[PDB]
């Protein structure tokens with residue numbers, strides 16, 4: 001067995017303290033181990049992000065604009081969670097594909113069937129005005145060309161929507177497929193437990209203070225770094241059993257999940273963090289039909 | 292006569308401490324009082340900016356890429372000034388119009404006859420590599436549509452060229468001609484002595500630290516503010532005679548010029564700042580053929 005002792009998991013990209021030459025053979029390996037693992041991956045990250053905004057007092061009264069929301073099964077859990085906590089939030093879910101019918105019939109959630117373009121963004125901004133907007137983007141076209149285009153669309157979402165905060169899908173193009181340097185919003189590169197086995201994808205989390213917008217350039221050397229750091233995380237770290245992690249499941253991803261869940265707020269009071277987390281996890285897995 | 296006592300002039304936009312409702316009638320008033328006033332306006336601002344970079348040790352060894360450089364008569368003075376000071380700089384002047392022939396025959400200055408587009412910017416960047424680039428932009432198409440387009444081109448200059456510093460032409464669209472909010476690089480809004488009588492134009496000066504790029508949104512309310520602050524500056528301030536300004540010319544613009552010139556470095560040592568400034572001014576006016 002692959003056992004180890006860890007104080008805390010790698011929460012953000014910058015924390016990864018080692019790297020490994022990427023082995024293309026890893027692409028042929030089992031990408032997922034749990035049913036609806038993708039819904040779980042998203043639910044944890046979005047719960048983490050939104051709980052932070054709550055902590056900073058910027059969630060209540062906002063409209064969450066989620067672009068690339070379909071099917072969005074897990075979004076129903078998110079909605080119920082904050083709705084039951086007493087937080088007042090309107091949800092606007094936009095995607096050209098159809099949403100899970102469990103999202104229908106809720107006065108607080110609007111489902112829109114539209115692929116957004118710059119022009120459309122302008123009209124929703126005018127229509128949402130004067131509400132404060134929290135943006136969540138999970139759009140997907142892939143080629144580096146598709147990526148750059150998705151990233152360019154994401155930056156235009158922020159400029160036009162002018163959100164108080166945002167969570168954006170972020171996966172750096174692979175070095176051997178570099179095209180050109182580009183900019184992405186400045187934010188924390190949140191790491192994702194339950195991401196596919198060898199996924200280099202993370203979520204860019206940003207909070208907008210003032211009327212400024214900070215961006216950061218991304219170069220091929222950065223792309224080389226992302227590949228090696230993420231490969232080391234996937235191949236070595238995520239394959240560890242944290243034996244000093246007293247929890248029903250000691251695998252790295254549950255240890256990582258634990259740390260995200262411990263930040264989440266609840267109505268019910270627990271005698272320990274372990275009690276809260278086990279409850280949240282149980283609740284999440286049951287909702288998603290994960291054994 | 293319109294007399295007053297001033298400690299220092301308004302150096303940057305933020306310093307303007309009052310505002311006045313814009314009177315459209317002012318557009319019919321004499322815009323310029325000195326021959327080649329436009330060359331003088333540019334020469335002072337660019338000398339100010341470049342002396343700052345020298346002060347910060349980032350000028351020597353750079354290539355100044357000036358886009359919208361033609362005719363560029365005043366650029367010959369700038370070049371001679373730093374060339375005689377011992378600073379090693381290469382100049383690359385690009386414009387689709389022809390440059391003043393006084394710029395020819397200098398190994399350190401390259402004249403290019405080309406209207407730059409994003410594609411061209413990429414090729415010059417690849418060709419200038421690995422030199423550090425200082426960008427100066429004075430491109431002009433006008434309508435708010437022309438402006439936005441010029442500003443969008445300027446942001447692309449910075450992203451592609453990735454300069455260590457930049458000086459950009461900056462005039463906010465007029466409120467009654469607003470189209471949409473937009474972003475411009477973060478920088479100091481340098482005020483310009485000898486700008487046309489009622490001009491609302493300034494120069495955005497930026498120094499790039501790290502691999503970040505900070506932008507700032509500009510709204511119609513900001514456009515309303517620019518109009519009133521600049522109108523107050525033009526109508527009231529610039530029309531003042533600074534009687535406690537012991538100098539051959541006590542008009543506001545000479546008082547303002549004085550402060551810019553006092554920052555400029557020289558080979559010759561002077562017993563007073565007044566002596567240095569009078570010398571620099573004399574030298575500048577003689578070069579430009581201004582009585």
Ligand SMILES: Nc1ncnc2c1ncn2[C@@H]1O[C@H](CSCC[C@H](N)C(=O)O)[C@@H](O)[C@H]1O
Pocket residue numbers: 042067068069070071072073074075094095096097114115116117138139140141
């Ligand atoms: N311009 C655009 N506007 C809206 N949705 C877009 C888009 N481009 C792509 N998409 C959507 O991006 C989605 C990627 S998969 C998204 C999964 C979803 N976040 C979940 O929770 O299940 C697809 O449904 C696709 O239709």
Ligand SMILES: Nc1ncnc2c1ncn2[C@@H]1O[C@H](CSCC[C@H](N)C(=O)O)[C@@H](O)[C@H]1O
Pocket residue numbers: 333358359360361362363364365366385386387388405406407408429430431432
């Ligand atoms: N894309 C572009 N590339 C280069 N020059 C451009 C341009 N668009 C406009 N211009 C130039 O912008 C200039 C505006 S006037 C510039 C005056 C010059 N800075 C001086 O010192 O005299 C014109 O010469 C025009 O040809």
Ligand SMILES: C[n+]1c(N)cc[nH]c1=O
Pocket residue numbers: 022027174198199200227230231
């Ligand atoms: C995950 N990954 C791939 N799938 C291909 C290249 N490099 C990489 O890190």
Ligand SMILES: C[n+]1c(N)cc[nH]c1=O
Pocket residue numbers: 313318465489490491518521522
């Ligand atoms: C200078 N100016 C104009 N020329 C027109 C409108 N508002 C303004 O400040």
